[PDB]
Design a protein around this ligand. Structure first.
Ligand SMILES: NC(=O)c1ccc[n+]([C@@H]2O[C@H](COP(=O)([O-])OP(=O)(O)OC[C@H]3O[C@@H](n4cnc5c(N)ncnc54)[C@H](OP(=O)(O)O)[C@@H]3O)[C@@H](O)[C@H]2O)c1
Lengths: 291, 288
């Protein structure tokens, strides 16, 4: 019942998890290269650890959330022994090919591994907001689902045994994720010029931001399918509009690099043919590599 | 009451219904006239020329390619327009809405800068949402009628036209920012023999999911310090590599993320490595 758990790496993200556990019964031991950065967790009742092995030792579940698989690897190895016998959940961010590669390493060292992908932000962690995708040893997944739920109680979730995907998806969403932050921060810079509090702006954004997810679902079909007979609008429209946006930004006296880029693609896609086609067609351009 | 609309673009046609399927009897016309049928079959009123079309309603709605087009229409019907009231929904900049605004008042033609946020289907539904800007007086008069098209959120700003349009711009960028990430993302899982059909749902999940946290930034921007909570630039920075690294590895267009990084790189270079992705804004204040 709320069993123990050990988490490694105390980034903004690192620390957020610990609480979910701590602030979910699960007694949590924690360890981090530089240390110091803890108090609140310890104050909130955590256990700082002598060394890594000590930290590992002290729990059946080992969560690792750090910079990069490079880091990960050069932790594990030193405790590789101690890990066998315990399940390793890697939430460090990494590519398909990285997840896949680290998956193998553990199995070859007889360590049950899970490659989890976080879709939540420090705050969100522990809430019905947060959502994770894990992939790996279904046995292990089933085995600790409970404790795992602590962080994404709404959607602690598992995909088949191939790790690649969990991570792959992770990438996909990222980028989408940035795609927004950008448009928004840009849009905001825009209304910035008009002495408009983002506080003001955002709401309506988010209003329209919710509005779009609609059309997206419709587009998927077009890609899944083929002909990009347009429903929304032609590329050529979108294309022009980007100019305007660019034109706007420039006029306003703020970075215009973003939209101008957006156009170049439109331009390409158009150049490539499908000017009449829905923005769907853009996909064909992404299927097409850039080096 | 009656209503008249101009332009049978993708957008043009969509609206008709909202009107038609909202009482408003609609006598419209089109640049490339020779289309309606289904509309006319669904029971429209097709006028002959522009003035004819203007004549035939107290409210007149124009949605065409671009303010360039718009402008070179007005004159011909400029007579018929006085008395009626036109709401420009042709896609156009602040400074274009501004110019259209001026010209109108200077000919006592009542104008509104209106911003459509919906997709053909969505039009007329509690989904659709419109942002207008113009004369308080005018708003009251057809608020109810106006609601017909965006029954959830037919909505009005200060008197400035610029803004309605401005906002419009702000979003579309956001809007593209998505379509891209998605289409790219989709190409990504493409490689893994993954139907977009499959992918999209979760996209849309995350598509809804983020707008939340974004708002948490607004204060930081409105404020100053970008003390990070979420994640430092430097994190995002690394992640973008991976994404880029991913795409490349997988054998698909990589130019996009490679860009993302450069900015990250800049922002970092420009100090705020520790700061939330918020800080990126400061790079937008810096012109191209
Ligand atoms: N922040 C978020 O919102 C968020 C969301 C989803 C996913 N993530 C993922 O979570 C991970 C970290 O995010 P974060 O913001 O918590 O990162 P962070 O603030 O940079 O923390 C990462 C941790 O990695 C440790 N570390 C890794 N390799 C090390 C090494 N070789 N030597 C010493 N310390 C090492 C760092 O310890 P020292 O620096 O003290 O040595 C630090 O505690 C990343 O993989 C990221 O993709 C973050």
């Amino acid at each position: 019942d709320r069993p123990p758990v050990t988490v490694v790496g105390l980034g903004l993200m690192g620390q957020a998890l610990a609480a979910a556990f701590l602030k979910g019964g699960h007694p949590t031991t924690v360890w981090n290269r530089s240390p110091e950065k803890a108090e609140r967790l310890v104050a909130d009742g955590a256990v700082l650890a002598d060394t890594l092995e000590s930290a590992v030792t002290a729990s059946p579940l080992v969560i690792v959330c750090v910079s990069d698989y490079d880091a990960v690897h050069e932790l594990i190895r030193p405790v590789e022994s101690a890990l066998a016998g315990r399940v390793l959940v890697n939430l460090t961010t990494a590519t398909s090919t990285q997840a896949r590669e680290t998956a193998e390493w553990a199995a070859q060292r007889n360590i049950p591994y899970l490659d989890g992908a976080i879709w939540a932000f420090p705050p969100v962690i522990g809430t019905d907001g947060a959502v994770l995708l894990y992939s790996g040893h279904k046995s292990a997944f089933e085995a600790h689902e409970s404790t795992l739920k602590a962080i994404a109680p709404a959607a602690t979730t598992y995909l088949e045994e191939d790790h690649g995907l969990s991570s792959l998806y992770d990438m996909a969403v990222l980028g989408i994720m940035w795609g927004i932050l950008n448009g928004f921060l840009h849009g905001a810079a825009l209304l910035g010029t008009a002495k408009v509090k983002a506080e003001t702006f955002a709401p309506l954004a988010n209003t329209m931001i919710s509005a779009i997810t609609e059309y997206v679902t419709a587009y998927a079909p077009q890609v899944d399918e083929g002909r990009y007979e347009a429903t929304d609008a032609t590329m050529t429209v979108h294309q022009a509009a980007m100019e305007l946006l660019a034109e706007e930004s420039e006029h306003l006296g703020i970075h215009s690099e973003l939209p101008r880029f957006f156009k170049t693609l439109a331009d390409r896609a158009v150049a490539d043919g499908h000017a009449e086609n829905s923005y769907a067609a853009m996909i064909e351009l992404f299927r097409k590599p850039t080096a």
